Design a protein around this ligand. Structure first.
Ligand SMILES: Cc1cn([C@@H]2C[C@H](O)[C@@H](CNC(=O)Nc3ccc([N+](=O)[O-])cc3)O2)c(=O)[nH]c1=O
Length: 199
């Protein structure tokens, strides 16, 4: 059966204003009587995300491949829920997804892009990705401007795709929000078949 709700993902560097923009969009949709669930990745839904939290805080040392696969497993454990919501007509707004998986691991950990993409192959594909673009310039494992710049580069792997909407996120919060709302209004309203990464 068809996907009735719409699925919006935010991407961007650590300091790009995703939680503010994703929150404002959720508010906006609820105010237009759209039913909507706000999700983010990584999260601590299960023991998998608890391990990810220790990694981010540098409490444990993990191999590149080990952590990369936990980040993907954290998404797969939400596919039943995301499929169910979208089937019912409930929208999903999600802060980070598989594109973070690929950009952070290939950029910061120098893992091969294709190897990074494989485990997320088959995830539900969003309707659109808003990339909050903030050039990095002058607590957590990847917080260090040179590492941010490496990840800024690997994020360009997706820059040419039809679903990828670049948003200049150096602008005023209100103007970024208005730009995002303008784009969301363009989304097709009718139900559609589910698509999957990396189609
Ligand atoms: C979903 C996903 C995310 N990531 C990285 C590591 C971490 O989970 C995230 C980057 N960290 C942040 O964006 N940190 C952050 C800290 C403070 C704020 N803030 O609002 O002040 C916002 C973001 O993105 C990653 O490496 N692989 C993944 O699959």
């Amino acid at each position: 059966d068809k996907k009735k709700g719409k699925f919006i993902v935010f991407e961007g560097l650590d300091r790009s204003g995703k939680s503010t923009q994703s929150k404002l969009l959720v508010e906006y949709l609820k105010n237009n009587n759209v039913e909507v669930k706000h999700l983010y990745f990584p999260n601590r839904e299960t023991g998998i995300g608890q391990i990810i939290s220790k990694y981010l805080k540098m409490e444990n040392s993990m191999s590149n491949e080990t952590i990369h696969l936990l980040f993907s497993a954290n998404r797969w454990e939400h596919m039943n829920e995301i499929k169910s919501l979208l089937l019912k007509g409930i929208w999903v707004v999600c802060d980070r997804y598989a594109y973070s998986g690929v950009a952070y691991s290939s950029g910061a950990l120098n893992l091969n892009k294709t190897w990074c993409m494989n485990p997320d192959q088959g995830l539900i594909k969003p309707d659109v990705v808003f990339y909050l673009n903030v050039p990095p310039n002058y607590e957590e494992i990847y917080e260090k401007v040179e590492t941010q710049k490496k990840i800024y580069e690997t994020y360009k792997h997706f820059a040419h795709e039809d679903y990828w909407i670049n948003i200049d996120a150096t602008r005023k919060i209100e103007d970024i929000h208005n730009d995002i709302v303008k784009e969301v209004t363009k989304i097709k309203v009718e139900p559609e078949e589910f698509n999957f990464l990396w189609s």
